[PDB]
């Protein structure tokens, strides 16, 4: 009698990656699910990706470490460094709370204050910053890591004096993965991936590309030599094969681009498109570009050069011609507002990248996977 | 609805003094955090805050 | 006594030729002994203290103008961030009123 | 013929069949299995490959 991997095993790989980590508290199917397959499951994710599977009597949690961190990756409801080193300096504090003590927002807001590490102190007279305390405990309560004894956080926006009873929970401990030294001695986060990487010397190749295409949107190939791309072009077809066997995605290669796209997209997950209105303009601009090849001509590496004015440019044709259909966020916005948060959009799936010198922009080979247009009927509707 | 343009109006000019606060904000931070990094550089030696 | 004085005003001023210059004297100890170099070493400290005083005095009127500027952006964001607010609650109120 | 064959094609067929050995391993491991180095003489010398 022996295990395989299964629809269960596939199941418990999807909640897996796509949560920070499953509680036994508040997610018991989930994990009650993932621990019967968590050998095979432990077994699949050592051989292919290297993660370590830590499985808890409280909690379950796969360290994804990413091949080369990207802006979507970090805690979204945060905005500003500020809000991580409160985040950060938050956590500092719970490690002087025994489980289940209770503390007041007060006594949180001092410690902070205190152990705060900018050479500009933090001071909550400010509106800024006390909203940046309320986004870091909205995060923070969203993890279980803290529990609120009744009150109200929010009304601390506008309200300093504001007061707020708040209970440590168990799982401010486990929070935090474990680091290779005395973590202290290191100086700059890019060193902390060179250890995570000297663990998995057997393979890393595997590996490195197993976690890209499982987690970015996309793998970039970096030039005609890429390592990474040259090991996806030489197995693409048991690369195909092992992922729809061990997974929901199926697996796509391109000159200049490799993906793994979703069918059937559960509800938890996050995909592209969505009903963001950005993406809207996003296809939009791919159809754009599709039908211009020789004004767009891509580089040998599948990338599109533009200058801010030139796609300012383009950002003003959409708006004449599909503009009408925008949503009415952006048909109010001016062109460089527009230019802005498409970017930033672009930027979140790794469409494009906005050179650090020149200011130039590349539009990466996975945008014209996909195209966009209005109904006809409306847009023959648009010409009335 | 008349309610509603007239404070999206004024939305748009806040923005716009928002935007313009934050610039010059910004230019002074980056002055000041210059001028810390000076003195720390000159003031390093010293056993004294 | 003067010792005593000497090394505590070293200690305030953290003039660490201090200890280096009163053994410098001790190495010596009885000879027609030269301060020249000890009296330049307290002035170049002294003329260091003046710089530091200087920008410390620089830092603080920028610090003053950047908490005056900081605390102005922050209300603006405030007034805005409200009247953000207000206008989503008429949006959805407008909704319910079609 | 082998041993007509010079020294200089050994060593091009040496280093082709390490490579392919190489990618062989490769390929069978991800098939999740142990590969034996049998099953990987039988996937290099696999002419229809």
Redesign the interface.
């Known amino acids: 009698q022996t295990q395989l991997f299964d629809e269960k095993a596939i199941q418990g790989m999807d909640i897996l990656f796509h949560h920070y980590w499953i509680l036994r508290a508040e997610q018991p199917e989930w994990y009650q699910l993932i621990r019967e397959r968590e050998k095979v499951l432990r077994r699949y994710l050592d051989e292919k990706f290297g993660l370590r599977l830590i499985v808890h009597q409280h909690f379950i949690k796969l360290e994804k470490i990413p091949v080369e961190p990207e802006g979507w990756m970090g805690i979204q409801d945060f905005q500003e460094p500020m809000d991580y080193a409160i985040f950060c300096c938050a956590l500092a504090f719970l490690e002087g709370k025994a489980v289940d003590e209770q503390f007041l927002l007060s006594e949180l807001c001092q410690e902070i204050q205190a152990d705060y590490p900018g050479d500009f102190p933090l001071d909550w007279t400010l509106y800024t910053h006390r909203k940046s305390l309320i986004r870091a405990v909205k995060v923070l309560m969203e993890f279980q890591l803290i529990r609120t004894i009744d009150g109200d956080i929010g009304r601390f926006d506008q309200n300093e004096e504001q007061e707020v009873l708040y209970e440590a929970s168990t799982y401010s401990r486990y929070f935090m993965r474990t680091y290779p030294d005395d973590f202290s001695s290191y100086q700059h986060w890019s060193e902390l991936l060179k250890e995570d990487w000297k663990l998995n010397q057997e393979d890393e190749r595997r590996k490195r590309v197993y976690r890209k295409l499982f987690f970015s949107p996309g793998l970039h190939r970096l030039d005609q030599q890429d390592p990474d791309f040259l090991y996806i072009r030489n197995y693409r077809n048991r690369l195909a094969e092992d992922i729809e066997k061990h997974s929901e995605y199926k697996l796509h290669v391109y000159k200049n681009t490799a993906f793994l796209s979703i069918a059937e997209p559960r509800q938890y997950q996050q995909v592209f498109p969505n009903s963001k209105a950005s993406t809207d303009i996003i296809l939009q601009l791919s159809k754009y570009i599709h039908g211009e090849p020789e004004r767009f001509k891509a580089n040998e590496n599948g990338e599109i050069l533009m200058t801010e004015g030139e796609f300012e440019q383009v950002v003003d044709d959409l708006r004449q011609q599909f503009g009408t259909g925008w949503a009415k966020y952006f048909r109010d916005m001016s062109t460089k507002g527009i230019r802005t948060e498409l970017l930033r959009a672009m930027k979140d799936w790794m469409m494009a990248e906005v050179d650090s010198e020149t200011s130039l922009i590349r539009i990466k080979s996975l945008t014209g996977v996909m195209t966009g247009e209005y109904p006809s009927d409306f847009q023959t509707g648009g010409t009335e | 609805?008349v309610?509603?343009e007239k404070?999206?109006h004024?939305?748009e000019e806040?923005?716009k003094?928002?935007f313009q606060?934050?610039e010059?904000?910004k230019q002074?931070?980056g002055?000041?955090?210059v001028?810390?990094i000076?003195?720390h550089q000159?003031?390093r030696?010293?056993?004294?805050s | 006594d003067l010792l005593g004085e000497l090394q505590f005003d070293a200690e305030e001023a953290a003039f660490s030729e201090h200890e280096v210059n009163v053994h410098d004297f001790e190495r010596h100890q009885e000879e027609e002994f030269d301060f020249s170099i000890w009296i330049g070493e307290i002035g170049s400290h002294e003329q260091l203290l003046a710089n530091l005083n200087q920008l410390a005095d620089e830092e603080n009127r920028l610090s003053e103008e950047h908490n005056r500027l900081q605390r102005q952006s922050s209300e603006k964001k405030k007034e805005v961030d409200a009247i953000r607010k207000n206008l989503d609650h008429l949006a959805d109120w407008f909704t319910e009123e079609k | 013929n082998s041993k007509f064959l010079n020294e200089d094609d050994l060593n091009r067929i040496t280093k082709h069949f390490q490579s392919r050995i190489g990618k062989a391993k490769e390929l069978i491991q991800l098939r999740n299995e142990g590969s034996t180095l049998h099953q990987v003489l039988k996937e290099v010398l696999d002419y229809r490959k």
């Open positions: 609805n309610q509603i404070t999206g004024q939305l806040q923005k003094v928002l606060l934050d010059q904000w002074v931070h002055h000041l955090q001028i810390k000076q003195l000159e003031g030696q010293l056993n004294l």
